[PDB]
Amino acid sequence: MRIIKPFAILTPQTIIQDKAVAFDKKIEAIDTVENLIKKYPNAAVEHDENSLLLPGFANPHLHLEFSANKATLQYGDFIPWLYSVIRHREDLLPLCDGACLEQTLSSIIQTGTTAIGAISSYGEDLQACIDSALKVVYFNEVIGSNAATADVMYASFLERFHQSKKHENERFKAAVAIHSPYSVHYILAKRALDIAKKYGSLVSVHFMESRAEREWLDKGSGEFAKFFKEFLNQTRPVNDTKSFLELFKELHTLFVHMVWANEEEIQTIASYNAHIIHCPISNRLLGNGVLDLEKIKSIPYAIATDGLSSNYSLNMYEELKAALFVHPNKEATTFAKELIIRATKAGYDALGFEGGEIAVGKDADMQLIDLPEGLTNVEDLYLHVILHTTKPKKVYIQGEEHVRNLYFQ
């Protein structure tokens, strides 16, 4: 049992001063140090009066297998980016060996993230995710728009799903991902989602990431048309959007990106057990614009980085700074608070892990970070945490101090 007394606790929803946190695997109590030592005489008190305690981040959406990318994939424009993934994945995947994956996951923990949603396309990241101290939801992604090869795509997905499922534990959950509404045949999506239903898996899907997708699925025209004709010899979209979206009605689904979603889609998703995953850097760098947060206000959202295939880091502090800037007209002190809540509590809710809040009964998944100097208004704390922090001093996962440095469960 340990007691930490920081300058303040971000819960994240509230700022608590003059209290400490008692924790072992879970957060056991939040009270004055004097009260806590009466209850927990075996817990040494650690005073960190120049530090803040907040939950570990959840990063519910990243593509680990692409972690070798720095400047190989084409940024600025979504269809050219996609062509570059197809052209270069055979080079990039082998470059990210076990050392690349280990280093990447360690970097994630060292920057204060304690839970992730890993989108896995080939299963090459399985061993790294089961070894990692991070809590991982491991989304086995299926892709394929051609009915002729749907059996093969399903077989691959099924094998990967079962290969991952044998490793489940408190820090590893097997899950299902549908690549998108343009790239997965309806019948293949349905069969993969039947597996999710059978096993009670979380589901993730990229939905309305680009205007090209919007126009292709609405009209069968636009920038995707050349891509589908050239690469796939397809002349029209394989899925009706409404029919595809209906497949998710009985599942807990992460709808990722959502930049180009329309009002009907948003109303439908609001009626589901669903979260939106907002990836501001990835959307901006791939020429996809910015998610309008007011339009999706009926649906909870969380923040993620996407992979290094469309981002220059997996540091959630960097993602949160970018989020402040791509929504530049949102008043900064209040929006920083919203962002910190969405990056902790909301992301943990999206992943279904018990954490993301400094609250009794939650796993002690926590970050200890430097207190920004010269603070005059405690309400400004959330903004200054985003602006001045790059990495925590300590990171706890289930009460275990992993960054003190152990990166493996």
A 10 A CB-CB count for 327 gives: 18
Cβ at position 320, least distance to its own copies in Å: 12
Reported residue count of the chain is: 409
CB nearer to its own copies: pick between 287 and 399: 287
304 counts as binding K ion under rule CB under 5 A: no
With CB cut-offs between 5 and 8 Å by kind, which of its own copies, K ion, none does residue 137 bind? none
Nearer to its own copies, 95 or 406 (CB): 95
Q: Return the residue nearest K ion (CB atom).
A: 171
């991952």: which residue's tokens? 164
Residue 203 is encoded by which pair of tokens? Answer: 């589901």
Closest CB 370 distance from its own copies, rounded Å:
10
| CA contacts within 13 A on the Cβ side of 37 | 7
Q: What is the CA radius of gyration of the chain?
A: 21
Question: From residue 298 to residue 327, what is the string marking binding to its own copies with x (rule CB under 8 A)?
Answer: --------------x--------xx-xxx-
Question: How buried is residue 133: exposed, middle or buried, by Cβ count under 10 Å (0-12/13-18/19+)?
Answer: buried
CA-closest candidate to residue 101, choices 279, 303, 308, 282: 308
d(CA 191, CA 183): 15
Interaction of residue 63 with its own copies, rule CB under 8 A: no
Grouping H, G, I as helix, E, B as strand and the rest as coil, residue 181 is coil
Residue 139 near residue 119, CB atoms below 8 Å: yes
Q: Is 396 helix (H, G, I), strand (E, B) or coil?
A: strand
Contacts of residue 154, Cβ cutoff 8 Å, sequence gap at least 6: 142, 188, 191, 192
179 annotated among ligand-binding-site residues: yes
Place of tokens 């791939």: 286
Query: CB under 8 A: which stretch of 4-12, 42-50, 276-284, 352-360 binds its own copies?
Result: 276-284
**Is 139 among the residues that bind K ion (CB under 5 A)?**
no
Task: Round to whole Å and give the CA distance between 40 and 20.
Answer: 12
User: Which is closer to its own copies, CB of 41 or CB of 374?
Assistant: 374
CA 274 to chain centroid, in Å, comes to 14
Please say which residue, 135 or 384, places its beta carbon nearer to its own copies: 384
Residues in region 347-406 near its own copies by CB under 8 A:
372-377, 380, 383-384, 387-388
28 given a catalytic annotation: no
Place of tokens 């056991």: 28
Q: Which of 172, 182, 255, 348 binds K ion (CB under 5 A)?
A: 172
Using CB under 8 A as the criterion, what x/- string covers residues 220-259 for binding its own copies? Answer: ----------------------------------------
215 binding partner (options K ion, its own copies, none; Cβ < 5 to 8 Å by kind): none
- Cα 297 to Cα 395: distance, rounded to the nearest angstrom: 31
CB of 311 to K ion, least distance (A): 21
| Cβ nearer to K ion, comparing 171 with 278 | 171
Residues in CB range of 247: below 8 A, 6 or more apart: 186, 189, 190, 193
* Binding footprint of K ion, residue count (CB under 5 A): 4
Asked if residues 397 and 133 have their Cβ atoms less than 8 Å apart, the reply is: yes
Q: Is 145 annotated as a binding residue?
A: yes
The one catalytic residue in 124, 209, 265, 357 is 209
- Select the binding partner of residue 374 from K ion, its own copies, none (C-beta < 5 to 8 A, by kind): its own copies
Q: Rounded distance, CA 249 to CA 165, Å?
A: 24
Task: Examine residue 201 and tell whether it contacts K ion (CB under 5 A).
Answer: no
* Site membership for its own copies, residue 29 (CB under 8 A): no
What are the residues binding its own copies (CB under 8 A)? 68-77, 84, 88, 280-281, 284-285, 287, 289-290, 312, 321-322, 324-326, 328-329, 331-334, 372-377, 380, 383-384, 387-388
- Per the annotation, binding residues for substrate are 141, 145, 179
Catalytic residues: 209
What are the residues binding K ion (CB under 5 A)? 132, 136, 171-172
